[PDB]
Amino acid sequence: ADTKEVLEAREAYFKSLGGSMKAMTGVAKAFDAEAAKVEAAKLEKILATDVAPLFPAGTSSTDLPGQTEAKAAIWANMDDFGAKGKAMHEAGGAVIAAANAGDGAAFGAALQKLGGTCKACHDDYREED
Numbered sequence: 001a002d003t004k005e006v007l008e009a010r011e012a013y014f015k016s017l018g019g020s021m022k023a024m025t026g027v028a029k030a031f032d033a034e035a036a037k038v039e040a041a042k043l044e045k046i047l048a049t050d051v052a053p054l055f056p057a058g059t060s061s062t063d064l065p066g067q068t069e070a071k072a073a074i075w076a077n078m079d080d081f082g083a084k085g086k087a088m089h090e091a092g093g094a095v096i097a098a099a100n101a102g103d104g105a106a107f108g109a110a111l112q113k114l115g116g117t118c119k120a121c122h123d124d125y126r127e128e129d
């Protein structure tokens with residue numbers, strides 16, 4: 001694709017996810033049902049973004065040095081990359097459901113699971129440079 005925009009788009013998407021994770025961690029530390037539901041509503045919209053089109057072949061850190069942290073491995077293991085993304089979506093759905101139920105204990109436990117999915121993908125597909 002016209003490389004510039006996909007790189008901006010996916011970085012914006014992950015940045016918003018990071019912000020969401022940061023806010024929900026604070027809520028988990030001091031559970032408040034209304035704060036949890038507000039963050040969940042935001043996360044719900046973020047998770048609706050289809051990022052597949054944002055990862056066209058040829059946009060790795062090897063192809064565009066210093067402009068992205070996406071490892072070439074992503075395109076070498078596309079099915080796994082998609083599997084890891086689905087795991088996050090599922091874990092994220094579980095967090096939203098917990099927040100909407102107003103269950104603090106379920107919210108915290110679900111948040112840990114979501115965090116694990118960020119790490120699982122980062123470990124294999126994101127540059128640590």
Ligand code: HEM
Binds near residue numbers: 081
């Ligand atoms: C888990 C909910 C999750 C979070 C949180 C998260 C955050 C995140 C940030 C803050 C970045 C850097 C973005 C920036 O430019 O500032 C980032 C980057 C990448 N991520 Fe991530 N990420 C979470 C989850 C996942 C999952 C489940 C995957 C893989 C299926 C994934 C992948 C990536 C990749 C690739 C990058 C690099 C993108 C680029 O540099 O173009 N992340 N993530």
